[PDB]
Amino acid sequence: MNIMLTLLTNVTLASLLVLIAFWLPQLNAYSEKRLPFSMKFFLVAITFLLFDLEIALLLPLPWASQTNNLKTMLTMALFLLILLAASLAYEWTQKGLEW
Template sequence: MNLLLTLLTNTTLALLLVFIAFWLPQLNAYAEKTSPYECGFDPMGSARLPFSMKFFLVAITFLLFDLEIALLLPLPWAIQTNNLNTMLTMALFLISLLAASLAYEWTQEGLEWAE
């Protein structure tokens, strides 16, 4: 019950913050706020530079793997079992899952930088 209450509270708070983040900037949106500022001079060019989609995909992949490692790797020790075989089996399974995910990403050429 305590876990459900925590999950519900965290989900509600996250959704509330996302809603506020999208709603708040729309209150005072006008062109002067969204234009680039260069020390009182007119802008020399566009402030929006093109962004490499490949870099974005590699960054998202890194974030996913990083979160997976940070959240799942301590799991075998967090369940507090006295059976060493259970802990090692779960740790080996999670590391194997990460390795298989990395191998899949590699075979799908998601980590290739050159086009």
């Protein structure tokens, strides 16, 4: 309820102020007178997507520290971060981070 009302107020104020900005100077009269598709940017976007997926895997860490199985969770988190570093290293050594 409160969050819905806050978002609605933000959107309403932004819309009102942008529209008055776009319409206040529209009342007075004036004159009123490709291909390249670089591959590197796509690789940057795909690398961002994959790293974002691995980050999403890393996100439940603050709650995983209270499990009473500390050794197993530490091993698994270190494993995830090690494979993240391995992905970065593989893309580094295969000339995937060049311009």
